[PDB]
């Protein structure tokens, strides 16, 4: 079978600036193992092809995973903007695949705060679709250059979510999987 359990029920998930991608190649895939599950917050397949999907064949499947706030999961989708879709994770407009996401307050909040999950807050430009930026070069907001020293106009580009179990559902951590379907000229392996 295709190792979709290794991505969906992993104990740890990546920060969104460092979003993880796992490749699914040469394997038989049980899609029913997901599309018969529960308390998933959202399971929209933007891939106008797959609306609920089915048992299709794909040259490869790719799973992209990360943790974002609750308010920001809107962005994990065609044509949106904001800190998450501009600076962290951006899908193309020609997207065929699904955006699976669930509330993980149970796993990713800590009494007094989990601060291990981060996002990029400053960036000189917007990401291209499926592009990743894990650099930590100080961001120059003004015109005086920074020279490795943080201060006015010289901001460390990443910020942490302050994930606490108390705050509203919109500020709570959610895990997100993004399945994308590759259709190349080659044996359909899934």
């Amino acid at each position: 079978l295709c190792p979709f359990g290794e991505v969906f029920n992993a104990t740890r998930f990546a920060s969104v600036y460092a979003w993880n991608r796992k490749r699914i190649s040469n394997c038989v895939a049980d899609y029913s193992v997901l599309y018969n599950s529960a308390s998933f917050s959202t399971f929209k397949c933007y891939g106008v092809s797959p609306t609920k999907l089915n048992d299709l064949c794909f040259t490869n499947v790719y799973a992209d995973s990360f943790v974002i706030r609750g308010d920001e999961v809107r962005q994990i989708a065609p044509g949106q903007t904001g800190k998450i879709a501009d600076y962290n994770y951006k899908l193309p407009d020609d997207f065929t695949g699904c955006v699976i996401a669930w509330n993980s307050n149970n796993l990713d909040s800590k009494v007094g705060g989990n601060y291990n999950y981060l996002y990029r807050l400053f960036r000189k430009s917007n990401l291209k679709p499926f592009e990743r930026d894990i650099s930590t070069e100080i961001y120059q907001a003004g015109s005086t250059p920074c020279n490795g020293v943080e201060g006015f106009n010289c901001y460390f580009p990443l910020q942490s979510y302050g994930f606490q179990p108390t705050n509203g559902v919109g500020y709570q951590p959610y895990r997100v999987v993004v399945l994308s379907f590759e259709l190349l000229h080659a044996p359909a392996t899934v």
Epitope: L121, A141, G142, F152, N153, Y155
Partner: nanobody
Framework: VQLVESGGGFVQPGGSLRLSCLAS????????MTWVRQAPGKGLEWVSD????????FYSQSVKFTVSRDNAKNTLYLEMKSLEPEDTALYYC???????????????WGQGTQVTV
């Protein structure tokens, strides 16, 4: 064309303080204003913003703290209560250049006032 913080000193855990920032040289009404924090050898930490008139105030995860503005007296205030020791840093008054609250490009700021709880 400047900004001078004032207030602060040494106070005890659970004490208080009211910092002031006398602006000068510009139309204090036409701008948002900011408080940021800098512990020694660290980056800027954003504390609060306030809008032109004073009815929208945005704070960080430190409500312990209230921002006020008297655009007649060109003064920006920050009343700090229920201080912790972790609230110790140098406290800056700063004006953004051109509302998503938090750190942005600041075109003017002051010299700082030390708060050590």
């Amino acid at each position: 064309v400047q900004l001078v913080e004032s207030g602060g000193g040494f106070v005890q855990p659970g004490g208080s303080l009211r910092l002031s920032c006398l602006a000068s040289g510009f139309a204090f009404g036409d701008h948002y204003m900011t408080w940021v924090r800098q512990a020694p050898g660290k980056g800027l930490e954003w504390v609060s913003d306030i809008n032109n008139y004073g009815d929208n105030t945005f704070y960080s995860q430190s409500v312990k703290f209230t921002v006020s503005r008297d655009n007649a007296k060109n003064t920006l205030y920050l009343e700090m209560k229920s201080l912790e020791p972790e609230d110790t840093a140098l406290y800056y008054c700063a004006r953004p250049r051109k509302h998503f609250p938090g750190l942005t490009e600041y075109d003017y700021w002051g010299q700082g006032t030390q708060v050590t709880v």
